[PDB]
Amino acid sequence: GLPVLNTPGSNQYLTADNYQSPCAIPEFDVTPPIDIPGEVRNMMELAEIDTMIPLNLTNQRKNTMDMYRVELNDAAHSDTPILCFSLSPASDPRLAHTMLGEILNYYTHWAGSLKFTFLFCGSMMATGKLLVSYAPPGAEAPKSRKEAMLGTHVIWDIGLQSSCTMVVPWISNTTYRLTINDSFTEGGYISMFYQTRVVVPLSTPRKMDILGFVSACNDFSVRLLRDTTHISQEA
Amino acid sequence: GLPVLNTPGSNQYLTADNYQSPCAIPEFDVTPPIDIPGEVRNMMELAEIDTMIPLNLTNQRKNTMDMYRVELNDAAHSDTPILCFSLSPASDPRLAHTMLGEILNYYTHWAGSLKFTFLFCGSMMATGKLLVSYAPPGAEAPKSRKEAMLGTHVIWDIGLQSSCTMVVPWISNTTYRLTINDSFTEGGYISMFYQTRVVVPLSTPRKMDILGFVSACNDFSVRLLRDTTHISQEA
Amino acid sequence: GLPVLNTPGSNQYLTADNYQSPCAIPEFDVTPPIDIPGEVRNMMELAEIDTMIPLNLTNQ
Amino acid sequence: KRTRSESTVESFFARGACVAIIEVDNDAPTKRASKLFSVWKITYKDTVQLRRKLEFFTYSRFDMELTFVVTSNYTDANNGHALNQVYQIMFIPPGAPIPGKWNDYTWQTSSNPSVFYTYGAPPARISVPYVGIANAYSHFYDGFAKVPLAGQASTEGDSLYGAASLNDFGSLAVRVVNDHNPTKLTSKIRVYMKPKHVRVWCPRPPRAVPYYGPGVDYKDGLAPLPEKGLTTY
Amino acid sequence: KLTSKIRVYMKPKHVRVWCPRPPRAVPYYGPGVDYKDGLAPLPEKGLTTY
Amino acid sequence: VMQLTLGNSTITTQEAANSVVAYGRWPEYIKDSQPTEPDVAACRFYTLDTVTWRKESRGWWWKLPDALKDMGLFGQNMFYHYLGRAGYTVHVQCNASKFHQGALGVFAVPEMCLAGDSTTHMFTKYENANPGEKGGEFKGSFTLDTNATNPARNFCPVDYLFGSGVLAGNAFVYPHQIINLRTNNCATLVLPYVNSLSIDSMTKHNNWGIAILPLAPLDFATESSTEIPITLTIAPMCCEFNGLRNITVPRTQ
């Protein structure tokens, strides 16, 4: 017969192989498909959908609805940050549980910019100005508005727009970032401060909540599919 | 099915084989390459780079900087050789540790000519004349300038040129030479003698050092890749 | 994958077989040949050379 | 006589070399002294041949072939013979779960690449493309993962010289999927690395002293040059 | 007596999907969507802590 | 005769040895295949601390862009921007007369990793691995730091090992120059940006190392002692900075 050679790797099972296999049900009548609404062809298409961020993970607000809201008041202007977190979507607890974080948890490497949106849920009479800043990697995390205003930032003018979106530029020293906690691929920090204050008239609520959302940009991509760290099974 | 034959050699592992294997990470996004300066496509390109020769391997100068220098003085002319070594780059201790020797240690057979360069590190006022001779294989190693001047030789005129390069012709009885110590593929000898003397004026150093370098020529080639003899591992 | 059949004679060693085998020294620089006098391409060419016959095989 | 076909980067690097040996045991779980599964961090610095070959250049790009040569033996000869052994080798990329038990959920291989080997079969071979986050693999890193900053506590901001950012390339978990044999069996898998399509940049001088750790540190054996007369052939 | 175990591995091909759903947050209990415990997956983190 | 004009600085010499462009490529800006460009404001020559060459000198080493951390606008941009990229122009000056003897070897090493002085692997701290403008020195032998209570956590370069366990003779594989006191009293090197990334952090990663070794002993006439100043002047080229943020203040001591 035709000479053959049993090259290395034969008689082995690989979970990511692609070989033709015999059909267990020959000549089966396959049901024709139908146009089911909501066709998805790439997982990244889901990463571009806004997901509410569980920003407040305090011991009292954890694992309830309150963790999805950030509180604001009409107190005098202060440089103390309103909100702070790190650009580690696959490692930060506040972002790892979002759709972006969940998808990233299935992959080892990722790249691309992100959109962070904030929605104001106060009254119409309420108005104010807020600052949202992104500190690039390699610098001490901002501790006051004075350090926050040294980098990319956006102004949320509550009174003209009820929502504000900020785009995080792809400032990195590597082509791709890792989905684990490591100082090699730090993504920087994102902080939110007051600009002047929240102003409300008489007979108006003085405690108003804002909602945060995170989504992927058009350039977002992932690679090196891997198992997630938020899954377990008995035995 | 199609008849097959299990020819000899099947179901075997060979470390130098070339067979297609299944991809463990299908559809991976490979990072595009970039033009990193210093691209090398052949190992021989490194063999052409000059490497300082640890010529003086005396018990006092060994394993320090002093082994990289050869001393000269202003004494009267003498036929005693200044420097002597054998053209065994892969076996001679003074040449086996150079880049040429290290590369040759990875291969069993080699061929081609070589360049031996000498640089004078004395003062400007210092001048002299030196002889560098190559004795072909099959003859008693030169013991004096009188025997040295019977073969290929070059004159280093210290005072006009601070460096002198000599090309060793490929005088061999075999197509390729071995990288081990054997009389079958002797490469000859290289010796360095005084011509008149080193001359220095008043208030000038009387002990001056010269530096030796070895490099491969454009016709140099190697074959029969093998493990080196300068590598070890515990257990 | 492609169906295969292990026909009789497989997994056997034959001293007069001819099958391609992997190269143990890939990309080796083979020394060019030279015209050595006395090339022989067939053993019969040697059989045509006269050979002295040991005709007398007596005990002495 | 030149040719220069065996001196190319491909020829120089396209050779299989053993980088690690993973040892596993098939025994009763109740024996805490036995290791039912093993985990090995992927790296070429556990050996000296391929490490020395690779450190000849500062930067490199290449695809890789992994070969798993499996051997096994008994710890006794008074218990007859055991059944055929089947081994599972699972790839754990960064951030993926690390198996904790021999039969925990992490072995489901829902998305982790896995290779199943049957004893006696030809050694398993797999191929992986370039998976470096950067544009080229780096064998040396003159820097730190974390840079301490003024005002930071002395217990924070510290990192080892060079650390590891591009070197986090996952691990391999090896186990036996067959039932625990009554008699203890010891198995060893040798991992052979074979690079292909190798491009190199920034050549470096060969190592002169024995390798001590993944870095460039050395402690002893700093006298490789022997003794030879200056005027002696 | 001999004991044998066969692991069944499922590998889908030519996969088309519709109607995306959010990822599961709590451990799976039964073929349905029921849950009994482990309903606190979110850890603790300061609001203004990086 | 050489004239190096860059930015608002000019160096003129009549004892040069031409120059070598590392890997045959000059520094260039990133091609397509908001940035900050100081241009001439940063692309100029800065003079580092002058060192003394003696008979007992074993060698000196500097790190780049570490040596320029305090050199005006370049260091300011490095500490203000997360990522950066720039080539280097290095000029080594070693004046000598006709009665002097010796030779210096200048080596530009990419990823110049140096062995530590402690038993623990890679245990040198950042503050000791980044000397700054003052660079460091080479030792004639390996000394092990046994101060367990307060380890020095410094490098322990060895002259004949090049500080990385490699014979000094092979150090010529790197782009190099030779300053021979009898032919030239200065040398110049052009080092393009080298890294696995187009841009990288200017504080976490060092791109180049400059090593000055005494290839030949220093001597002068028949005197029992002599000293030669060695000056190292470095200029960044094609400066590019990215990721503006709050100023970074590396820890000291």
Ligand SMILES: CCCCCCCCCCCCC/C=C/[C@H](O)[C@H](N)CO
């Ligand atoms: C069971 C399936 C096993 C799958 C194995 C996949 C492992 C992939 C490892 C990629 C390693 C890349 C090659 C190493 C690069 C250089 O050596 C490092 N950058 C320097 O240490």
